[PDB]
């Protein structure tokens, strides 16, 4: 068989992407310290490549790629919150709605950043919501000297605009009473 | 053209019906969730 057909080494998947190397280091550290990770990406093909990388490294994962049926989504949520073996839960930022309660994890890794910081905020709130009993750490991976720095700059500008506009004013009844 | 008291009485009847419906939906959902979690084998 080895003399009959040759397949690309699974190792070269990580070698061809610096994000994958940094994510391998980060995921090994997180599993050593005993945490659970949510990986959010904008592309489902990136979900497939992440499946290859995670299966190569031995991290058990579940997947909700926005094409899964609705009745399956609640089952996946319950399984992930109940099972302590599942290390990662790869997700698409634009999917899942608002009804997903992923309080089981305690770490969020954004493989790529959305242009709209509200979508990233919803992805974070998927794990930072009420009823969650651990500190939440958000990891954002950005490729140096690429468009991703522009994406992060745009997202930060939008966040600053939101802080100026809505968060700047108290917008509560306390201001009217005072 | 109905008055407030008639609306309150109709609200009471509809409240009874809606509570029945809510209880039935809760029972069905709980039973389905309990049945999903089951997993066994054979000797």
């Amino acid at each position: 068989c080895n003399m009959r057909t040759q397949f690309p080494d699974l190792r070269l998947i990580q070698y061809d992407c610096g994000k994958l190397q940094t994510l391998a280091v980060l995921l090994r550290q997180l599993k050593a310290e005993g945490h659970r990770v949510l990986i959010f990406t904008q592309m489902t093909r990136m979900l497939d490549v992440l499946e290859q990388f995670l299966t190569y490294h031995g991290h058990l994962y579940l997947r909700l790629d926005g094409s899964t049926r609705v009745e399956q989504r609640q089952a996946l949520m319950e399984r992930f919150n109940a099972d302590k073996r599942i290390f990662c839960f790869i997700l698409s930022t634009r999917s899942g709605g608002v009804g997903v309660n992923l309080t089981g994890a305690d770490t969020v890794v954004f493989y790529d950043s959305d242009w709209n910081p509200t979508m990233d905020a919803q992805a974070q709130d998927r794990c930072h919501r009420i009823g969650q009993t651990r500190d939440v750490h958000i990891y954002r991976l950005i490729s140096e000297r690429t468009v991703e720095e522009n994406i992060l700059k745009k997202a930060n500008q939008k966040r600053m605009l939101g802080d100026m506009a809505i968060e700047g004013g108290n917008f509560t009844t306390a201001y009217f009473k005072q | 053209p109905l008055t407030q008291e008639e609306l309150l009485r109709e609200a009471k009847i509809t409240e009874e019906l809606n509570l029945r419906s809510l209880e039935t939906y809760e029972r069905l959902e709980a039973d389905k969730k309990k049945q999903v979690h089951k997993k066994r084998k054979c000797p």
Binding site: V70, G97, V98, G99, Q122, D125, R129, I130, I166, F171, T173, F176, K177 | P1, L2, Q4, L7, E10, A11, K12, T14, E15, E16, L17, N18, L19, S21, L22, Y25
Partner: protein, 154 residues
């Protein structure tokens, strides 16, 4: 040169009208008996948190002052519960049993129906899901007074 002055005077007029509205709202909210003016709805049949009660009071103030508003509470603070409490208050005290329309995303529709039935079973809830024939059948005779109180639709 005149364009800047015209824009400034128009913005000043808008700011003045908005300041009048804000002053009216502040005067309405300052009425004494912490000192929440609006009591809990007798039909609410649930326990609200303090800030939810404050939001209910603000919503009732907006209704009385006849101003439309955005409830931008963060996720999980109970925006749906606040809306249901507002509707229960209006129906019980104001008599506003009138047909209300709630447009929600399709995924959240069943959850909203569940919340309406949990908090306010009194309301005759109509849900507008289904195919064209089912929707037409569920419509039939909905112009009748006191035929449906709240409608949920996508």
């Amino acid at each position: 040169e005149k364009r800047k002055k015209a824009l400034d005077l128009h913005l000043d007029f808008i700011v003045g009208q908005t300041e009048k509205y804000s002053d009216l709202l502040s005067q309405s909210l300052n009425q004494p008996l912490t000192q929440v003016k609006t009591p809990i709805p007798l039909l609410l049949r649930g326990q609200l948190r303090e800030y939810q009660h404050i939001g209910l009071d603000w919503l009732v103030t907006m209704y009385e002052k006849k101003l439309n508003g955005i409830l931008a509470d963060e996720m999980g603070l109970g925006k749906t519960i606040q809306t249901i409490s507002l509707l229960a208050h209006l129906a019980c005290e104001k008599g506003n049993w009138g047909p209300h329309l709630i447009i929600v995303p399709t995924s959240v529709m069943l959850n909203w129906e569940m919340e309406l039935k949990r908090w306010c079973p009194s309301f005759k809830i109509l849900t507008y899901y289904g195919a064209q024939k089912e929707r037409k059948l569920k419509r039939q005779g909905w112009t009748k007074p006191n035929a449906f109180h709240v409608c949920i639709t996508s």
